[PDB]
Homo-oligomer: A and B are copies of this chain.
Amino acid sequence: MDKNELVQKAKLAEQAERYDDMAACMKSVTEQGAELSNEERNLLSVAYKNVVGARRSSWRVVSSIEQKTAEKKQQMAREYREKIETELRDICNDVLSLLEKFLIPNASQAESKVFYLKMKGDYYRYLAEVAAGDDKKGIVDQSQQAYQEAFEISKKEMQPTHPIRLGLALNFSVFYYEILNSPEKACSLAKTAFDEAIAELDTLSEESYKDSTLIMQLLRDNLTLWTS
């Protein structure tokens, strides 16, 4: 019913590990038209990361089985993969519709704009993971374009230690490495984001120092993995 009821229900669903419900609640909140609070935005992101993540995981497992085999068996694996892909696409399109119609329009502050543009990049990235052929070049570009706009704004409006800025760098670096298969650009972005953050350690805040340093370490972890 009311925004408060939905958010209470979403929080119950989260406790119950029932993310489809959680997503559905936060979709209704989003559709009421008003800008989401930080709490609500985190709830929305978590719900959908989990919902889509189950399909991503399934897809990798089935895809890996498909390639590792015969015939008829591969025909079964391939048809299941496609069933999962269709689910995954519907989920991504649901989020991306939400971003375009509600979340990005209503973003009053640079932080929020960066966050949703990052999220747009992510869901297009999830589509790209699963896209074949003629569709793909266009989905990849959509992802890059959303990340890139976010990156621009983040560099203009946000300190180099801001968790959301560092998060974007992490994900954008991952886009370069996994989707565009460009490790040098991936390393350079991650290294720069890290280096700029240690250079402005002065800027870490009460509210954020934990998230900042955590994501800084994730950047290093990826760099270490990638330069081995």
Contacts and interface: CB of A to CB of B under 8 A. Distances in A.
A13 B79 CA distance: 12
Contacts of A54: 17
Interface in A44-70: 54, 57-58, 61-62, 65
Interface of A: 5, 8-9, 12-13, 15-18, 54, 57-58, 61-62, 65, 73, 76-77, 80, 84
Contacts of A73: 8
Given A16-B84, A84-B16, A9 B61 contact: no
A203 B77 CA distance: 42
B57 A12 contact: no
The A contact surface, by secondary structure, is helix
A18 B58 contact: yes
Per assembly, the copies of the chain total 2
Contacts of A12: 62, 65, 76-77, 80
A80 B17 CA distance: 13
Contacts of A76: 5, 8-9, 12
- The listed residue with most B CB atoms (<10 A of its CB), out of A5, A12, A61, A80, is A12
B9 A58 contact: no
A8 B84 CA distance: 16
A58 B16 contact: yes
Contacts of A80: 9, 12-13, 16
A76 B2 CA distance: 12
A190 B13 CA distance: 37
A18 B81 CA distance: 12
Given A5-B76, A16-B84, 16 more contacts: A9-B76, A9-B80, A12-B76, A12-B77, A12-B80, A13-B80, A15-B62, A15-B65, A16-B57, A16-B61, A16-B62, A16-B80, A17-B57, A17-B58, A17-B61, A18-B84
A9 B12 CA distance: 33
Contacts of A18: 58, 84
A123 B16 CA distance: 21
